[PDB]
Structure formats: structure tokens, C-alpha cells
Design a protein around this ligand. Structure first.
Ligand SMILES: Nc1ncnc2c1ncn2[C@@H]1O[C@H](CSCC[C@H](N)C(=O)O)[C@@H](O)[C@H]1O
Ligand code: SF4
Length: 262
């Protein structure tokens, strides 16, 4: 019986972020009507806020899959808060025309305003305009009446960056600032798809970054401890996972039984 949920419905992505903590282990995505069934179960178990993530949410079916679930959550389930977290690179303006009215919040991952740092940490596909893309997406959120947030992973390569003026110029509703998180089997392990150890920062370095940006009123910190205690993952099979063997899928045992495992 949860209030908010992070639904990582896909693990496919077009970027290669070196620290990615939710890696391309599978290509499975549920049939649309199976996801719709699980989302309804969550609604009936008392869900109020849903956040679509991955993976890159806009990759599947050029965003139409995501748009259909977004519309189902707002129209059919009457969820008062529907959000997406995206790297932003595959978002088409046409998506906003077709689905934007159902979307409350679009959070775009941007870890640096230094386009060298962004290419280095893997946040791109080659064009090295990932930050110029950000102002276009900000403008689309303004024009299509979607709240715009920025997600940043604080890591070895941006820990001393001063982002104050850049974040202020974008005027996001929120700037969610995550300490780089290690998850064994995801970005840690000899067989893992990423090895994030070299990206990690200490709690002291993280706190120093927050203090440097204390003038940014919309800043919301997400330390390692906060993520481990409060960030709940519903994976691409609609099994529950935490950030510290997955549960049974809610599609098989229900929300109550599945939440007990995690
Ligand atoms: N090692 C790590 N520690 C903390 N946050 C991480 C992380 N790896 C990824 N994230 C963040 O988790 C969120 C979901 S990742 C999937 C959403 C989308 N592909 C995107 O990049 O925006 C993103 O903000 C991402 O940058
Ligand atoms: S963190 Fe980077 S590699 Fe990981 S899913 Fe988001 S854009 Fe893709």
C-alpha cells in the first residue's frame, strides 16, 4: 500500500553513463495491457504519485508506449501526480502535443553544464549538445504546461562544479541532487555492466557540494542514505526492488504480498 512509486519499466537506453545504477540487464518490457493491470492494482492499493523511469523511458516505441501509460494513469486511474525522468535526448515535441496534457512533471537528467564533463561521464550520444537540448526542453515544458525539474548525479567529475547561475537560468521547479550510488550487481561487480567505484564521492564531498549551492532555493538533496531508505523501485517485471533477489511480481501475487519481500 504505497503512496509514491518509481516504475523503471524498461532497462534499454541510448546513453552510456559510466555510473548508471539501473543497467541494461534485460530488454523485457511488459505488454501495455499487463502494465495497465499492475498500475490499476497499485491505484487500488492506494497509489497517488507515479514516476516513470528506466532505462530511457522515451526509447520504447518512440515514446508512444510511455505516453499511453502516462495517459492511462491520469485519465483512467486519476493519479494526481504523474512524472517522468528522462535523459531528454529522444523527446519529440509531438509527444507533448499528444500526451503532454496528462503529464504533471518532466525531470531531465543533467549532471554538468561543462559539455566536456558530460561527454566524459557518458551522458550523450555524440552530438555534445546535451546542455543546449536542456533549454529547448525547458521551453517545451513552459509551452505545454508541464512542470520542469532537473536531476543531477553528483560524482567525481562534477563534485567541484559551480552550477548556481546555470540552474537559476533554467528556473526549474526542483533540482534533485543525488549522491552517486553504488548498487551491487548493477554498477558494481566484475560481471556488472557498469563499474561506478571510480565515480563515487564521500558524504563530506557531497555535503560540500550542497553547501556551495545553498542559494538555490529549489535544491533537494538525495544522499546515499536517503535513497537506500526511501527510493523504492518497481522493475520491468513489476517486482519491487530497493537500493541496498527481487520480490514476486505484483501481477502474480498482488501489491501487498510483493511489498513484504522488499
Ligand atoms: N549511480 C547513480 N546514483 C544516483 N543516481 C543515479 C545513478 N545512476 C543514475 N541515476 C539517476 O537515476 C535517475 C533515473 S535513470 C533513468 C532515467 C533516464 N534514463 C535519465 O537518465 O534521466 C536519473 O536521474 C539518473 O541520472
Ligand atoms: S543513467 Fe544514463 S545510461 Fe543510465 S539509464 Fe539514464 S541516461 Fe541511460
Amino acid at each position: 500500500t504505497p503512496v509514491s512509486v518509481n516504475y523503471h519499466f524498461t532497462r534499454q537506453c541510448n546513453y552510456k553513463c559510466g555510473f548508471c545504477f539501473h543497467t541494461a540487464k534485460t530488454s523485457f518490457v511488459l505488454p501495455l495491457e499487463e502494465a495497465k493491470r499492475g498500475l490499476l492494482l497499485l491505484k487500488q492499493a492506494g497509489l497517488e504519485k507515479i514516476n516513470f523511469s528506466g532505462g530511457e523511458p522515451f526509447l520504447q516505441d518512440r515514446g508512444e508506449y510511455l505516453g499511453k501509460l502516462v495517459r492511462f494513469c491520469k485519465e483512467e486511474l486519476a493519479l494526481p501526480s504523474v512524472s517522468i525522468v528522462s535523459n531528454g535526448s529522444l523527446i519529440r515535441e509531438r509527444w507533448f502535443k499528444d500526451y503532454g496534457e496528462y503529464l504533471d512533471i518532466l525531470a531531465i537528467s543533467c549532471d554538468s553544464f561543462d559539455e566536456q564533463v558530460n561527454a566524459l561521464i557518458g551522458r550523450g550520444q555524440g552530438k555534445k549538445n546535451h546542455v543546449e537540448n536542456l533549454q529547448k526542453l525547458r521551453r517545451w515544458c513552459r509551452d505545454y504546461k508541464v512542470a520542469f525539474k532537473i536531476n543531477s548525479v553528483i560524482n567525481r567529475f562534477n563534485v567541484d562544479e559551480d552550477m548556481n547561475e546555470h540552474i537559476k537560468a533554467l528556473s526549474p521547479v526542483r533540482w534533485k541532487v543525488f549522491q552517486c550510488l553504488l548498487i551491487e550487481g548493477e554498477n558494481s561487480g566484475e560481471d556488472a555492466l557498469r563499474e561506478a567505484e571510480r565515480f563515487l564521492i564521500s558524504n563530506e564531498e557531497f555535503e560540500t557540494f550542497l553547501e556551495r549551492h545553498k542559494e538555490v532555493s529549489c535544491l533537494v538533496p538525495e544522499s546515499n542514505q536517503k535513497m537506500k531508505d526511501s527510493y523504492l523501485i518497481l522493475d520491468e517485471y513489476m517486482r519491487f526492488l530497493n537500493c541496498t533477489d527481487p520480490s514476486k511480481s505484483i501481477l502474480d501475487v498482488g501489491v501487498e504480498e510483493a511489498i513484504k519481500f522488499s
